């Protein structure tokens, strides 16, 4: 019920597809990556936002806020769009538009 | 890309 005026950030761990499926089962598809389930949770209004991990000392977009616990439980895996699985589509779009 | 001028501080 509380929507912030100031931008919020949260550290969260990446989870294995297997570990994530232990909760979400077959819902987890190939272009999805799970993170969270560790005491924090993306929530309404966070969608489309970034899930970054610093590759080679630089923040790399690894995930896009997508879906998860409808009540934003900080204990269930958060599901983000896996960018490695969508990156070529991204490149192909930039290269043709 | 990925290197903020204003460095982010976690915690």
């Amino acid at each position: 019920a509380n929507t912030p005026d100031r931008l919020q950030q949260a550290s969260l761990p990446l989870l294995s597809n297997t570990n994530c499926k232990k909760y979400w089962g077959t819902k987890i598809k190939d272009a999805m990556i799970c993170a969270g389930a560790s005491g924090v949770s993306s929530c309404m209004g966070d969608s489309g936002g970034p899930l970054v991990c610093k590759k080679n000392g630089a923040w790399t977009l690894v995930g896009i806020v997508s879906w998860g616990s409808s009540t934003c439980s900080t204990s269930t895996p958060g599901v983000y769009a896996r960018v490695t699985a969508l990156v070529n589509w991204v490149q192909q779009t930039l290269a043709a538009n | 890309c990925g290197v903020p001028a204003i460095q982010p501080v976690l915690s």
């Binding site: 929530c43 309404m44 969608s47 489309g48 997508s66 879906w67 998860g68 409808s70 | -």
Partner: protein
């Protein structure tokens, strides 16, 4: 009846303004939709909600 189903935010993390028929109030009331899932008691306007359910 779709008009008597609870307002459902869904699993997605968006914060979209939508409307659902609130049987308790006998009128349509606003709620925030997450962007996916949910049910049919989800309208984009109070007017369309009234037109369909009220």
């Amino acid at each position: 009846e779709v008009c008597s189903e609870q307002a459902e935010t869904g699993p997605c993390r968006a914060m979209i303004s939508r409307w659902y028929f609130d049987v308790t109030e006998g009128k349509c009331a606003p709620f925030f939709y997450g962007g996916c899932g949910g049910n049919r008691n989800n309208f984009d306007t109070e007017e369309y909600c009234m037109a369909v359910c009220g």
